[PDB]
Design an enzyme around this catalytic site. Sequence first.
Site, mmCIF file in Angstrom:
data_model
loop_
_atom_site.group_PDB
_atom_site.id
_atom_site.type_symbol
_atom_site.label_atom_id
_atom_site.label_comp_id
_atom_site.label_asym_id
_atom_site.label_seq_id
_atom_site.Cartn_x
_atom_site.Cartn_y
_atom_site.Cartn_z
ATOM 1 N N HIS A 1 -0.774 -1.086 -4.328
ATOM 2 C CA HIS A 1 -0.041 -2.217 -4.018
ATOM 3 C C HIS A 1 0.514 -2.193 -2.326
ATOM 4 O O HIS A 1 0.982 -3.086 -1.977
ATOM 5 C CB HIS A 1 1.047 -2.658 -4.957
ATOM 6 N N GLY B 1 10.336 1.711 0.508
ATOM 7 C CA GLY B 1 9.733 2.935 0.982
ATOM 8 C C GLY B 1 9.494 3.929 0.253
ATOM 9 O O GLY B 1 8.862 4.867 0.434
ATOM 10 N N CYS C 1 8.316 4.123 -2.808
ATOM 11 C CA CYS C 1 7.086 4.121 -3.517
ATOM 12 C C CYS C 1 5.933 5.281 -3.278
ATOM 13 O O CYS C 1 5.785 5.154 -2.007
ATOM 14 C CB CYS C 1 6.388 2.540 -3.783
HETATM 15 C C1 LIG Z 1 8.176 0.065 -3.501
HETATM 16 O O1 LIG Z 1 6.893 -0.836 -3.563
HETATM 17 C C2 LIG Z 1 8.246 0.376 -2.223
HETATM 18 O O2 LIG Z 1 8.975 1.192 -1.807
HETATM 19 N N1 LIG Z 1 7.216 -0.253 -1.468
HETATM 20 C C3 LIG Z 1 7.739 -0.251 0.055
HETATM 21 C C4 LIG Z 1 8.490 -1.234 0.629
HETATM 22 C C5 LIG Z 1 8.699 -1.245 2.130
HETATM 23 C C6 LIG Z 1 9.132 -2.200 2.686
HETATM 24 C C7 LIG Z 1 10.166 -3.159 1.875
HETATM 25 C C8 LIG Z 1 9.926 -3.011 0.601
HETATM 26 C C9 LIG Z 1 9.207 -2.164 0.022
HETATM 27 C C10 LIG Z 1 9.146 -0.758 -4.161
HETATM 28 C C11 LIG Z 1 10.349 0.072 -4.664
HETATM 29 C C12 LIG Z 1 11.491 -0.540 -5.077
HETATM 30 C C13 LIG Z 1 12.287 -1.282 -3.905
HETATM 31 C C14 LIG Z 1 13.614 -0.726 -3.982
HETATM 32 N N2 LIG Z 1 13.683 0.015 -4.897
HETATM 33 C C15 LIG Z 1 12.405 0.297 -5.652
HETATM 34 O O3 LIG Z 1 12.112 1.127 -6.515
HETATM 35 N N3 LIG Z 1 8.578 -1.349 -5.306
HETATM 36 C C16 LIG Z 1 8.840 -2.901 -5.168
HETATM 37 O O4 LIG Z 1 8.851 -3.158 -4.271
HETATM 38 C C17 LIG Z 1 7.883 -3.562 -6.546
HETATM 39 C C18 LIG Z 1 6.304 -3.466 -6.037
HETATM 40 C C19 LIG Z 1 5.433 -4.230 -7.237
HETATM 41 C C20 LIG Z 1 5.048 -3.456 -8.580
HETATM 42 C C21 LIG Z 1 4.121 -3.801 -7.674
HETATM 43 N N4 LIG Z 1 8.853 -4.496 -6.437
HETATM 44 C C22 LIG Z 1 8.354 -5.763 -6.086
HETATM 45 C C23 LIG Z 1 9.184 -6.829 -6.356
HETATM 46 C C24 LIG Z 1 10.143 -6.966 -7.157
HETATM 47 C C25 LIG Z 1 10.552 -5.838 -7.700
HETATM 48 N N5 LIG Z 1 11.813 -5.614 -8.518
HETATM 49 C C26 LIG Z 1 12.744 -6.738 -8.669
HETATM 50 O O5 LIG Z 1 12.611 -7.818 -8.336
HETATM 51 O O6 LIG Z 1 14.171 -6.059 -9.148
HETATM 52 C C27 LIG Z 1 15.323 -6.380 -8.624
HETATM 53 C C28 LIG Z 1 16.142 -5.252 -8.711
HETATM 54 C C29 LIG Z 1 16.042 -7.560 -9.498
HETATM 55 C C30 LIG Z 1 15.079 -6.875 -7.392
HETATM 56 C C31 LIG Z 1 9.718 -4.439 -7.266
HETATM 57 O O7 LIG Z 1 10.251 -3.559 -7.851
#
Ligand SMILES: *[C@](O)(C(=O)NCc1ccccc1)[C@H](C[C@@H]1CCNC1=O)NC(=O)[C@H](CC1CC1)n1cccc(NC(=O)OC(C)(C)C)c1=O
Length: 305
Positions: free
Chosen positions: A41, A143, A145
């Site tokens: 992703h 960040g 992930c």
């Molecule tokens: C992960 O992808 C990550 O760190 N990505 C890098 C990034 C850079 C800049 C801005 C955002 C992200 C994140 C990690 C998440 C976010 C905060 N804490 C974590 O554990 N994962 C996602 O963002 C994830 C990716 C999808 C599976 C492929 N994602 C996306 C959209 C929604 C959610 N979750 C969600 O909606 O739950 C609540 C809490 C209700 C917001 C999600 O985890």
Amino acid sequence: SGFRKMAFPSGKVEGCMVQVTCGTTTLNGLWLDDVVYCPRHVICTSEDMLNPNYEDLLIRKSNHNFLVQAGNVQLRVIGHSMQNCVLKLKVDTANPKTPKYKFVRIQPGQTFSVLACYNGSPSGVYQCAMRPNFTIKGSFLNGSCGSVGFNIDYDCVSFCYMHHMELPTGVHAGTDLEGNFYGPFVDRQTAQAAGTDTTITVNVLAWLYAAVINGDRWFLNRFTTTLNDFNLVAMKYNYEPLTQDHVDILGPLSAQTGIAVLDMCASLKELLQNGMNGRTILGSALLEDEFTPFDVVRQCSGVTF
Ligand SMILES: *[C@](O)(C(=O)NCc1ccccc1)[C@H](C[C@@H]1CCNC1=O)NC(=O)[C@H](CC1CC1)n1cccc(NC(=O)OC(C)(C)C)c1=O
Ligand SMILES: [Cl-]
């Protein structure tokens, strides 16, 4: 003496962390030999999350779309590849710091150390358990992930977890190092929820043994029970079923403390039906289920790596 939540030393794994950028999307990867493992992703922007056709996204990814960075060093990306939810970036450079390591798949109840990372740089280390609903009670920000979970066998790193998402309740989900989710989740932005959770019975028992071992034994009593007699009482407090497999493993702690699993069980039955009565156990005011039997032998016998 003493008993703490305790993570493996992270140094073996610190040396494997890199920063993967791909357009606007920077996250963390795991550098082993000439191959970085990260979440697929990373190709996606904040748009593509609703229904990503990963294939047709990656089909339009030149190897010079992928930046990789180990500290102050950029790598030449040469070969890509997708396996399940993990992307495999191939680089001219093998990782001098690569330890010995087997990719393994833990089951619910088994604990591991998480190295939280941002921009390929480690921030923190902490212990969690893979919950029976196949989630983890982590601490992760944007960040995070690509951060991985792991155990150690003297010198061998068993990586068992890559971090992918946050679920509605502030709990977390990810995959093994093959890129298969624990539990039913998928790597896009849809309605998904953890599903109902239970207390890891065998782990709570190991905790009690650890407590006995550290001179905390008010909770003890003058009776016993049978498995099924107990497995009734447990389910009524939302505890997992205790399998003969779970008694086998609790073996060592039963031996050392001079307490039969099933006597301890009776002491549990009491605590569920009666509470701690304003008391602590290893200074906790409720029952701890995120220490395995091995984590208790580990810490009270003091194994090394
Ligand atoms: C992960 O992808 C990550 O760190 N990505 C890098 C990034 C850079 C800049 C801005 C955002 C992200 C994140 C990690 C998440 C976010 C905060 N804490 C974590 O554990 N994962 C996602 O963002 C994830 C990716 C999808 C599976 C492929 N994602 C996306 C959209 C929604 C959610 N979750 C969600 O909606 O739950 C609540 C809490 C209700 C917001 C999600 O985890
Ligand atoms: Cl507590």
